[PDB]
Amino acid sequence: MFEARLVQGSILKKVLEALKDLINEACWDISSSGVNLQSMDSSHVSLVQLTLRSEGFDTYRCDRNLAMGVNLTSMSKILKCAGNEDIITLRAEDNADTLALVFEAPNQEKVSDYEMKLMDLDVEQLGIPEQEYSCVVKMPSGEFARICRDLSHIGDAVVISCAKDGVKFSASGELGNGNIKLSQTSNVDKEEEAVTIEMNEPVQLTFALRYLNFFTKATPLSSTVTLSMSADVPLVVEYKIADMGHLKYYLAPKIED
Amino acid sequence: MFEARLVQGSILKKVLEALKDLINEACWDISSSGVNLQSMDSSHVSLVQLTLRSEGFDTYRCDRNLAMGVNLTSMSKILKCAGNEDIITLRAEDNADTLALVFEAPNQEKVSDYEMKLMDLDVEQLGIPEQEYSCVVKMPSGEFARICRDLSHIGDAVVISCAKDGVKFSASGELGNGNIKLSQTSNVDKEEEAVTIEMNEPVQLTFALRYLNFFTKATPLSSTVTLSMSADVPLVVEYKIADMGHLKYYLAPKIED
Amino acid sequence: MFEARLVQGSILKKVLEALKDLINEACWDISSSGVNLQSMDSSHVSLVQLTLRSEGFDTYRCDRNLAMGVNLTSMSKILKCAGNEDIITLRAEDNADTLALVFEAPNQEKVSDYEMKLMDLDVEQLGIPEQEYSCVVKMPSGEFARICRDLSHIGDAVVISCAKDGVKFSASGELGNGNIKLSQTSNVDKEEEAVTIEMNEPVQLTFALRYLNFFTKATPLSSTVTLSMSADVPLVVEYKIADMGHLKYYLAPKIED
Amino acid sequence: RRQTSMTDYYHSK
Amino acid sequence: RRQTSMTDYYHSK
Amino acid sequence: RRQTSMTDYYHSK
């Protein structure tokens, strides 16, 4: 039996909006430490890793470890029926044939109970090592979303160059080319508003903008985004879900022979 | 000759938005008591009944009773050309080949005159008895619209169970099931914000959500909606147009043999 | 070499939004007086004339006169990547194979450089005489946009009648007819809010509403619009770009034999 | 198990 | 009864 | 000149 009660239901909603368009089906690993999820997209070019720690929920209880196969479109449909101020409780039986979602509205006269059917999925999961990256950029998530969307007008691929003093984003297509240069913030007043770069060696990689525009759907989860780059290693785009966990998108680069 | 002048033109606009998508053509019965309209949709599963009493208009004059056949798409197109703060005057001649709509703008330099062609329609109209219903629910119209829209994500049909302490809405589809339980308001502060149930016998009926989502287009007309249910009688969804009349939607239920 | 720096970048953005949907490709005439553009649409029914005077830019320098062939869809794509508060600098080399656009963001950590490819275009350009029109209407641009959009619901063509006391707009279609009468403003408080008519002879002309609804995309450039009409001469729809220049749309009328 | 019509309840007139 | 062109009024040049 | 896959870097397990 698994039961977790989360007062800020909006977080769950945003998570599902950050996943439903990239991957259709995913296995949720429930354990005493919390909720974990990992899935590549259908093309295997990108990967999503979600972690929601038990300490982040208002109440958490997991007796035996569970693996719930979920169609993410169905779960997002169910969660759109929740309000941003609802208290959301997830519950599953020991056999866990279905997953129950209880939404307690802020009107205090409305309680909703949804029962989502679960299925048995055989998902390909990868071993992601914990490593140190040659270049790390921390920037406002909205600025990053705007950059990816804007450069999608210019071309299909973006070249990210992380250097000591700043980071540059490059796109090229039939109509021409463009470069956006974000210098390291000189007057760091609000840490959420700043561009900071931690570098060991400068890094330069090429990525597909369609996947990045899928990634940026996590923007409502965090005011900042962190991009981690090493040479010929897939890039990591990290949104921290405050005081609970994170959502990480991994993107394989386009490499010249 | 018929002439009616209405200062709050927005009401007329909202009415036409509440009708244009459900029924294409309708006959408007003009009499000294006011305006009346009744029409089933093309499938005959639902019915619309509109009443705008003469006392509700700023000026009203009807010499002989009139029956104006109106394509509602055309009339809605004409009324979108009106502003929410326009004074709208409707006028028709004794022979009434067309209907005139005069919009006096709140800029006081703009007057618009539209002449909508009328046609002769043979509409099937039903005898709706005045009756007492076993269960009556009064609730915020926006809450009801949100409920119908949300449950349209879960399934095509909704089961409404009106009981003594509250009302439940149920949907089921391939992905699972859902139930929304609205308890009777315990602290009735604002009558517009409350859920109140008047019951003789509990009632339980199944309806098609597509028609209900057409009905909820009347939400801007009223802050509250009233649902009237008896066993194996079509449900009534009522929006009161304050100090003038009402719009009632009748929906035939889905019945098991 | 040509270089012009404009602090209010939003103006350029609005200009391109006012052009991109009407004409695909256009030649930009750069001279010491400023920027000029003229192009008919593909159907030759309408024409666009843009003038941005050198005095309106924060800095302007033109060594030799230039003619830059620009695909306007590409340029609008590039300018959507600019912010409304960006400082936009345009630059071109003496040979001018491409045009450079530099956007300096109001975040002061972001500078963007775009290089749009140019092409050699053979555009048909007309001689537009400077003349006095029999009727001139000056009105709020938003009121005019709303009128054109509204009457597009009634019919495809609009009859504009400019008279001494006011101006009338007429449309007719299968569903009927409509007339909007704007009287000359009686209490002219704010010149931007007024309808003023300067007449020598009353004028009455018929125009296609699709082109006018393309014209009204210039509404964000000006709070007022001026319509200039003479008998059997194409109408002029003028939006002044304050303290810099103007955008004029010419529309050939529909004439009865 | 069957969607009914408004005419299953009310007469036309 | 006929939509005219800009070239019906102004010469190209 | 080639889009790589996540499996080109990490093993499945």
mmCIF file with all atom_site columns, N, CA, C and O in Angstrom, chain A residues 38 54 57 64 81 111 116 124 136 145 193 197 201 209 215 247-248:
data_model
loop_
_atom_site.group_PDB
_atom_site.id
_atom_site.type_symbol
_atom_site.label_atom_id
_atom_site.label_alt_id
_atom_site.label_comp_id
_atom_site.label_asym_id
_atom_site.label_entity_id
_atom_site.label_seq_id
_atom_site.pdbx_PDB_ins_code
_atom_site.Cartn_x
_atom_site.Cartn_y
_atom_site.Cartn_z
_atom_site.occupancy
_atom_site.B_iso_or_equiv
_atom_site.pdbx_formal_charge
_atom_site.auth_seq_id
_atom_site.auth_comp_id
_atom_site.auth_asym_id
_atom_site.auth_atom_id
_atom_site.pdbx_PDB_model_num
ATOM 1  N N  . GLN A 1 38  ? 11.958  7.341  -15.080 1.00 0.00 ? 38  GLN A N  1
ATOM 2  C CA . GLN A 1 38  ? 12.956  7.480  -16.132 1.00 0.00 ? 38  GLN A CA 1
ATOM 3  C C  . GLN A 1 38  ? 12.398  6.915  -17.424 1.00 0.00 ? 38  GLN A C  1
ATOM 4  O O  . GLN A 1 38  ? 11.870  5.799  -17.438 1.00 0.00 ? 38  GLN A O  1
ATOM 5  N N  . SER A 1 54  ? 10.398  11.722 -0.711  1.00 0.00 ? 54  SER A N  1
ATOM 6  C CA . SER A 1 54  ? 9.356   11.528 0.292   1.00 0.00 ? 54  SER A CA 1
ATOM 7  C C  . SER A 1 54  ? 9.267   12.712 1.238   1.00 0.00 ? 54  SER A C  1
ATOM 8  O O  . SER A 1 54  ? 8.173   13.094 1.664   1.00 0.00 ? 54  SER A O  1
ATOM 9  N N  . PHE A 1 57  ? 6.638   15.543 0.334   1.00 0.00 ? 57  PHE A N  1
ATOM 10 C CA . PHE A 1 57  ? 5.196   15.397 0.449   1.00 0.00 ? 57  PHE A CA 1
ATOM 11 C C  . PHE A 1 57  ? 4.749   15.718 1.866   1.00 0.00 ? 57  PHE A C  1
ATOM 12 O O  . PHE A 1 57  ? 5.516   15.595 2.823   1.00 0.00 ? 57  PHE A O  1
ATOM 13 N N  . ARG A 1 64  ? 5.625   -1.687 0.515   1.00 0.00 ? 64  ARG A N  1
ATOM 14 C CA . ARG A 1 64  ? 6.493   -2.401 -0.407  1.00 0.00 ? 64  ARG A CA 1
ATOM 15 C C  . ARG A 1 64  ? 6.750   -1.537 -1.637  1.00 0.00 ? 64  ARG A C  1
ATOM 16 O O  . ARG A 1 64  ? 5.923   -0.700 -2.010  1.00 0.00 ? 64  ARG A O  1
ATOM 17 N N  . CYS A 1 81  ? -8.217  17.975 -14.402 1.00 0.00 ? 81  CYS A N  1
ATOM 18 C CA . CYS A 1 81  ? -9.445  18.070 -13.618 1.00 0.00 ? 81  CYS A CA 1
ATOM 19 C C  . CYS A 1 81  ? -9.190  18.517 -12.184 1.00 0.00 ? 81  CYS A C  1
ATOM 20 O O  . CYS A 1 81  ? -10.141 18.609 -11.402 1.00 0.00 ? 81  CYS A O  1
ATOM 21 N N  . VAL A 1 111 ? -14.836 17.230 -3.401  1.00 0.00 ? 111 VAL A N  1
ATOM 22 C CA . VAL A 1 111 ? -13.795 16.217 -3.356  1.00 0.00 ? 111 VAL A CA 1
ATOM 23 C C  . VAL A 1 111 ? -13.987 15.352 -4.589  1.00 0.00 ? 111 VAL A C  1
ATOM 24 O O  . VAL A 1 111 ? -15.117 14.957 -4.902  1.00 0.00 ? 111 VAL A O  1
ATOM 25 N N  . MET A 1 116 ? -7.277  5.642  -12.093 1.00 0.00 ? 116 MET A N  1
ATOM 26 C CA . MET A 1 116 ? -6.604  5.457  -13.364 1.00 0.00 ? 116 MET A CA 1
ATOM 27 C C  . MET A 1 116 ? -6.144  4.013  -13.477 1.00 0.00 ? 116 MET A C  1
ATOM 28 O O  . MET A 1 116 ? -5.457  3.501  -12.589 1.00 0.00 ? 116 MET A O  1
ATOM 29 N N  . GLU A 1 124 ? 12.735  0.544  -21.560 1.00 0.00 ? 124 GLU A N  1
ATOM 30 C CA . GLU A 1 124 ? 14.190  0.509  -21.593 1.00 0.00 ? 124 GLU A CA 1
ATOM 31 C C  . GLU A 1 124 ? 14.718  1.661  -20.747 1.00 0.00 ? 124 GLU A C  1
ATOM 32 O O  . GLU A 1 124 ? 14.449  2.832  -21.040 1.00 0.00 ? 124 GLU A O  1
ATOM 33 N N  . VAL A 1 136 ? 28.970  24.303 -16.770 1.00 0.00 ? 136 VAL A N  1
ATOM 34 C CA . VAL A 1 136 ? 27.650  24.363 -16.153 1.00 0.00 ? 136 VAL A CA 1
ATOM 35 C C  . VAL A 1 136 ? 27.153  25.797 -16.229 1.00 0.00 ? 136 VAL A C  1
ATOM 36 O O  . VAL A 1 136 ? 27.838  26.717 -15.768 1.00 0.00 ? 136 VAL A O  1
ATOM 37 N N  . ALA A 1 145 ? 13.777  29.347 -22.239 1.00 0.00 ? 145 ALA A N  1
ATOM 38 C CA . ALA A 1 145 ? 12.636  28.971 -23.072 1.00 0.00 ? 145 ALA A CA 1
ATOM 39 C C  . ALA A 1 145 ? 12.462  29.930 -24.244 1.00 0.00 ? 145 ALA A C  1
ATOM 40 O O  . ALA A 1 145 ? 12.228  29.501 -25.385 1.00 0.00 ? 145 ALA A O  1
ATOM 41 N N  . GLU A 1 193 ? 17.755  35.675 -11.056 1.00 0.00 ? 193 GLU A N  1
ATOM 42 C CA . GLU A 1 193 ? 17.809  36.514 -12.247 1.00 0.00 ? 193 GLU A CA 1
ATOM 43 C C  . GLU A 1 193 ? 19.166  36.500 -12.937 1.00 0.00 ? 193 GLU A C  1
ATOM 44 O O  . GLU A 1 193 ? 19.363  37.256 -13.893 1.00 0.00 ? 193 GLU A O  1
ATOM 45 N N  . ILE A 1 197 ? 28.285  30.918 -14.798 1.00 0.00 ? 197 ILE A N  1
ATOM 46 C CA . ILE A 1 197 ? 28.946  29.822 -15.495 1.00 0.00 ? 197 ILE A CA 1
ATOM 47 C C  . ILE A 1 197 ? 30.076  29.293 -14.628 1.00 0.00 ? 197 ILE A C  1
ATOM 48 O O  . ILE A 1 197 ? 30.929  30.061 -14.168 1.00 0.00 ? 197 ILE A O  1
ATOM 49 N N  . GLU A 1 201 ? 36.642  23.320 -18.673 1.00 0.00 ? 201 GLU A N  1
ATOM 50 C CA . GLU A 1 201 ? 37.056  23.497 -20.050 1.00 0.00 ? 201 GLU A CA 1
ATOM 51 C C  . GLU A 1 201 ? 35.839  24.020 -20.799 1.00 0.00 ? 201 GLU A C  1
ATOM 52 O O  . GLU A 1 201 ? 34.706  23.614 -20.501 1.00 0.00 ? 201 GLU A O  1
ATOM 53 N N  . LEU A 1 209 ? 16.491  21.418 -31.725 1.00 0.00 ? 209 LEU A N  1
ATOM 54 C CA . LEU A 1 209 ? 15.660  22.380 -31.009 1.00 0.00 ? 209 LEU A CA 1
ATOM 55 C C  . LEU A 1 209 ? 14.274  21.841 -30.670 1.00 0.00 ? 209 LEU A C  1
ATOM 56 O O  . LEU A 1 209 ? 13.660  22.325 -29.714 1.00 0.00 ? 209 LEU A O  1
ATOM 57 N N  . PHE A 1 215 ? 11.510  20.225 -23.688 1.00 0.00 ? 215 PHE A N  1
ATOM 58 C CA . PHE A 1 215 ? 12.080  20.354 -22.346 1.00 0.00 ? 215 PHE A CA 1
ATOM 59 C C  . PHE A 1 215 ? 11.529  21.575 -21.632 1.00 0.00 ? 215 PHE A C  1
ATOM 60 O O  . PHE A 1 215 ? 11.175  21.511 -20.450 1.00 0.00 ? 215 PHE A O  1
ATOM 61 N N  . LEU A 1 247 ? 13.530  17.606 -12.069 1.00 0.00 ? 247 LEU A N  1
ATOM 62 C CA . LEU A 1 247 ? 13.265  17.024 -13.378 1.00 0.00 ? 247 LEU A CA 1
ATOM 63 C C  . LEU A 1 247 ? 14.455  17.322 -14.278 1.00 0.00 ? 247 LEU A C  1
ATOM 64 O O  . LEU A 1 247 ? 14.813  18.492 -14.470 1.00 0.00 ? 247 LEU A O  1
ATOM 65 N N  . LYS A 1 248 ? 15.065  16.271 -14.821 1.00 0.00 ? 248 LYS A N  1
ATOM 66 C CA . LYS A 1 248 ? 16.255  16.373 -15.653 1.00 0.00 ? 248 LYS A CA 1
ATOM 67 C C  . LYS A 1 248 ? 15.958  15.821 -17.036 1.00 0.00 ? 248 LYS A C  1
ATOM 68 O O  . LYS A 1 248 ? 15.463  14.694 -17.168 1.00 0.00 ? 248 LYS A O  1
#
